[PDB]
Amino acid sequence: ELQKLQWAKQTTSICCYCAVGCGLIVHTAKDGQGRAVNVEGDPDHPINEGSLCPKGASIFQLGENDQRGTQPLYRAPFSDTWKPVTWDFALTEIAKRIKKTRDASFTEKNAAGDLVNRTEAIASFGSAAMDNEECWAYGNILRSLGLVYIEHQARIXHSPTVPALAESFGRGAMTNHWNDLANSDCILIMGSNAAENHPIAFKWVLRAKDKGATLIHVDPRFTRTSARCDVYAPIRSGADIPFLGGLIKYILDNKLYFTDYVREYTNASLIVGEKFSFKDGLFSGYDAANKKYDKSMWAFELDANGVPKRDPALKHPRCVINLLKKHYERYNLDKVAAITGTSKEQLQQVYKAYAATGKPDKAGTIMYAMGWTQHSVGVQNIRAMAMIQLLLGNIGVAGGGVNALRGESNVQGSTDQGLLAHIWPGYNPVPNSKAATLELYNAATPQSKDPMSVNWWQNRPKYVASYLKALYPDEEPAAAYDYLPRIDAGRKLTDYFWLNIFEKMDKGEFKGLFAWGMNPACGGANANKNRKAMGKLEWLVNVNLFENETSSFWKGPGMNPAEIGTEVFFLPCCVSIEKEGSVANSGRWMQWRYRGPKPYAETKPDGDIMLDMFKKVRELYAKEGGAYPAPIAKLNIADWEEHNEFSPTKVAKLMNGYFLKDTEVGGKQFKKGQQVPSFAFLTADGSTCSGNWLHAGSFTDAGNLMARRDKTQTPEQARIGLFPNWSFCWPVNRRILYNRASVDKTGKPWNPAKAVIEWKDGKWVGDVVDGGGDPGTKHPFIMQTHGFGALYGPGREEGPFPEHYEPLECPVSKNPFSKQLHNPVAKAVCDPRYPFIGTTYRVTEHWQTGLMTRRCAWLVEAEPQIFCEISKELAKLRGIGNGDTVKVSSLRGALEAVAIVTERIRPFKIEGVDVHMVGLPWHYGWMVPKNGGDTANLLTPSAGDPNTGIPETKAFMVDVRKV
Amino acid sequence: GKMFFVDLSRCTACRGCQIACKQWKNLPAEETRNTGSHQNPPDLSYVTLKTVRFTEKSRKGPGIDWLFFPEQCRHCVEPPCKGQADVDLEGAVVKDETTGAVLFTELTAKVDGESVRSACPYDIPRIDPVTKRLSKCDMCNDRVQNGLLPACVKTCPTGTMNFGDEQEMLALAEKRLAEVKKTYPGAVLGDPNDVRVVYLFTRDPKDFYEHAVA
Ligand SMILES: Nc1nc2c(c(=O)[nH]1)N[C@H]1C(S)=C(S)[C@@H](COP(=O)(O)OP(=O)(O)OC[C@H]3O[C@@H](n4cnc5c(=O)[nH]c(N)nc54)[C@H](O)[C@@H]3O)O[C@H]1N2
Ligand SMILES: Nc1nc2c(c(=O)[nH]1)N[C@H]1C(S)=C(S)[C@@H](COP(=O)(O)OP(=O)(O)OC[C@H]3O[C@@H](n4cnc5c(=O)[nH]c(N)nc54)[C@H](O)[C@@H]3O)O[C@H]1N2
Ligand code: SF4
Ligand code: SF4
Ligand code: SF4
Ligand code: SF4
Ligand SMILES: [S]
Ligand SMILES: [W+6]
């Protein structure tokens, strides 16, 4: 026996940091009645096999931390001190602010007199760090108060990824999952530093290499990832589309594509209309006045029925594949090598290695996380990755896919719960002011006349109806639909997003902000502006684990409390290991975790804080009246609690959904109160509720499938590592999306050695088939209207094919592909005093703003201070020696950092001038620790991209001086 | 008894091993400053039994050779640290019959602190300037004696850290050297016949650390 663990209750948990979703075992003293005594990895967990990176390994020090918030705190306007106060004070006083601001600000109709039923006087930030059930509860609480300005972390990686992959495949999700990396024959890591930012991923990446895979890292910098890849190819910032386009030309010219896959599973054969053209770097239908495209000019030629025309012979010169060939012929090795800064021989090597996976029995995968996919053609950058994978038949297959790595442990789940301004849960859109009725809302869903096209999104009315029943089960959906707020149809969608919330704050157009499990004082670009702008708030509610740069902006650097009138409530939430719930990892694995210790001090689970707070707002409206009470009054919250408090189990079950009455549906009988087995069995007619149609299948009558810890596998499952009985992923436990593309029209795998699915005994074996139906009877991309993987994607703002537009404004004046330099649908100053390219990125040991990891002594030990990584070339020119203090400055601000001089940074040749990049972590902040440094977001512009609502953090102009 | 095989050709310098050592023994963190390196703590100490050392070696063509060395006691088959301490007092340094663990006891407060360090070919032992106790990697011997992996081994996601019977580990170390050579032709084993912590180096062990090998 080990004395340490001897008298402790052992529970299981999931890591609270990155979306790899590593298993933990927690040991809690007094057999559960006191504090955690140990936290380490869960050896039975199939992703991490008990391994943890230093962030997971430090979770004991995060939990049992004397610097954690103990009780609610209050800061009175113009005070320079916190007043500790009771939960009951803080929550009653917060509910009053909400009601006051809502009553005062509530709009029943916009200027056009259309029904909106909202308040624009309160914005919410957060959070990818809450449990799925807390995320879902939160988004419905805010919308019952009529908020529209609801955002979080996801915005920065959603705006690019989801439209790109949704355009290409029908969903925006990471196509495969972490264990599947081990099945790849070529792994290309481009816009990711996964050995630092998804460390346990490298278990399976190296297992791939053990089976003969080539590992390719493409990055401006040589990182800890580069150290362990077979090929490190440097690339100048923003040169990705050139690189990806050069690879497309390589694949087409060398005929290395998967011919049968392309012909039948991609839109390669669809005929594009005669209106489609591209010339001088502009697509047809360009409106130079408004810098907008008339996408209607990119439509397909339709047959009599309204189905796009096809030439399966791929002869017709207006076939997608023939237009594609013609489009990328300009991207030869010499131009691409010139602009990327990658040698002609090193490009040829990387292209040959990766295009080799066009073999039916070889699979290549692309991993990217944030990289530089923030600019106005990041969506196009990822589009090109999808098109390469479609050409090589790498989509739907083991060791293939676009592995768009999610960031935070539950950013996947928090996005699924519609904590972005534009989505309800389950990726149903927030209605605009022009969707007067529920029926009009439903009328927008695109329909198909192809009988071989599943076009699954036609089921939406069932999902919207069930979602509205889950909130308002007394009322009819059509009627309940008038409760939740709508956004102005005559208005730019980005007007509601992350970056414009900071604009509206600094214009004082917000009374109240919830900063709920976020640290925007550090996470926001141009921190100096964001901190000033927080003064123009009337009240602030910060919910977090510790006092922080957002809770305590009022006593920040160069701030005077006396002059700042913002009423701040700080509410301390409990840590991941002190509550029960589910988090959805990058692979869509929805994982249940348990409480170890009771919440520290007077800290509450977020679920309890938000439910208690809403309970006060409710009883206040019930006794005072005020603006449109029905949506608050009528909100079903009794389904969210047992024994006076928030019940993760019950919220989870409501999210799955149940029958409100006995129903025949699917051709099966169901009794009232039965849990809904799957989204296949939801209804549009009020028979069924379901908080999120993606969760239908997750908590059935069989029990909580997310809580399964069962490693049972058939030989065919275990060979590729599906673990179908370990927890549950959406949709309906399909672990590899688009898996119908992995077999031919007889249902035989392209690669039987790594089969995902297979037709045997007249059914699909292995993974859960992504779309019902016999082999060769349905198109494989079931969420696509046409049912095909899109090479040509005419839903994209910048054009149906990705095209190089220079993301670096300042140091580049030549585009070797067209006479269109910058994005034709998109004003940096480029002050010569700031001649170097600033870039921010992460280290393995710290998390986000560092709010969490700057409180963990062991992580501060390994990475105590903000640093500045520079080449020897720049170090020499600026007279900087390794370890020297340096000042890094820009038009937006200045900071001090310890110099790291290393060959891991190198100059890029841009138009015959050496261009120097300086690298900073954004992990640091003024509150902790002593001498840590402040956020590298003092230097970043609030000038983010107009075609996204996303900031510039990978390329901003700076100077670096020795101090 | 038991042997660690550490394949440095798979190390990402994630430093899970470093934190996992402190979490398990509840060791305090040092006072650190960045002085132009990711490496921290800068050296082994009384309260740090393991730190990952970082060296950058230049190479023709893009990038560098970035060498990583998670340093710990070698648990030598014939411990020079025992031989040295047995001069002043037996029991200050003992061996575990079954596992191979060389273990410092409370009675290192009696021996000459600096004597026992000098005797150590890998420069491993560290003194508490207050109590005079010597500290180092104890092999998580209590964990091992209970049939658990040492913390640093369990936490390692890359396949760098490997643990078990000296027979199995020397078989693994030999088979893996043959595989790793195909990529890194200069790959060698750190004193395979003297120690119970066998590092695979992708090149000259001296490039990793002054005292990487004896
Ligand atoms: N340790 C740790 N892990 C984390 C996080 C953390 O803070 N710390 N955060 C999590 C979150 S929220 C996210 S979004 C993910 C993000 O994970 P990543 O995207 O991997 O994060 P970064 O290190 O910011 O950027 C990745 C790499 O992109 C490179 N890069 C920069 N510019 C370009 C360019 O123009 N082209 C290309 N091809 N590459 C470029 C950088 O040099 C860097 O190595 O990580 C998650 N994991
Ligand atoms: N310069 C620069 N800026 C960046 C980036 C960059 O690369 N460079 N990255 C951007 C990206 S990709 C992202 S995602 C954002 C992230 O930026 P933020 O979301 O502001 O990040 P943090 O708040 O530091 O990290 C997540 C928060 O979750 C909180 N948390 C943890 N557990 C819980 C819990 O149980 N409940 C609650 N309520 N809170 C909890 C932590 O305390 C922490 O405050 O930053 C962006 N900012
Ligand atoms: S931070 Fe990510 S890789 Fe590290 S232990 Fe946690 S979940 Fe796993
Ligand atoms: S845990 Fe493993 S991969 Fe990470 S630094 Fe230690 S030895 Fe290297
Ligand atoms: S490495 Fe040094 S301290 Fe460890 S057993 Fe050998 S001589 Fe003793
Ligand atoms: S074996 Fe135990 S004591 Fe030794 S370095 Fe590893 S974790 Fe630390
Ligand atoms: S994220
Ligand atoms: W992120």
Author numbering:
A (entry chain A): 36 to 861, 869 to 1005
B (entry chain B): 2 to 215
Reported in the publication:
In this context, the highly active, efficient, and selective metal-dependent Formate Dehydrogenases (Fdh) are very appealing systems that enable harnessing millions of years of natural evolution. Additionally, [4Fe–4S] clusters are present to convey electrons to/from the physiological partners. Additionally, the oxygen sensitivity of these enzymes must also be understood as it poses an important obstacle for biotechnological applications. This work presents a combined biochemical, spectroscopic, and structural characterization of Desulfovibrio vulgaris FdhAB (DvFdhAB) when exposed to oxygen in the presence of a substrate (formate or CO2).
To study the effect of O2 in the presence of the CO2 substrate, High Pressure (HP) gas soaking experiments were performed at the HP Macromolecular Crystallography Lab (HPMX, ESRF, Grenoble, France). Unexpectedly, crystals from the aerobically isolated oxidized form (prepared in the absence of formate) pressurized with 48 bar of CO2 in aerobic conditions resulted in a structure (HP_CO2) nearly identical to the Reox_120 min structure. The HP_CO2 structure shows the same SeCys dissociated form as well as clear electron density for a dioxygen/peroxide molecule coordinated to the W ion. These data show unequivocally that exposure to oxygen in the presence of either substrate results in the W–OO⋯SeCys dissociated form, and that, contrary to previous reports, tungsten reduction is not a pre-requisite for enzyme inactivation. Remarkably, a CO2 molecule is present near the active site, which has never been observed before. The CO2 molecule is found close to the W centre (4.3 Å away) and the catalytic SeCys (4.0 Å away), being stabilized by van der Waals contacts with the carbonyl of L440 and with the dioxygen ligand, plus a hydrogen bonding interaction to the NH of G442. Although the inactive form of the enzyme was captured, the location of the CO2 molecule may represent a transient affinity position along the CO2 diffusion pathway from the solvent to the active site, as suggested by Laun et al., 2022,30 for the Fdh from R. capsulatus. This is further supported by the increased B-factor of the CO2 molecule (∼50 Å2), when compared with the B-factors of the neighbouring backbone (∼25 Å2) and sidechains (∼30 Å2). Since the SeCys dissociated form was also obtained with exposure to oxygen in the presence of CO2 (HP_CO2), the activity of DvFdhAB was also monitored in these conditions. In fact, co-exposure of a solution of non-activated DvFdhAB to oxygen and CO2 led to 80% loss of activity in 30 min, whereas full inactivation of the DTT-activated enzyme occurs in 30 minutes, or less.
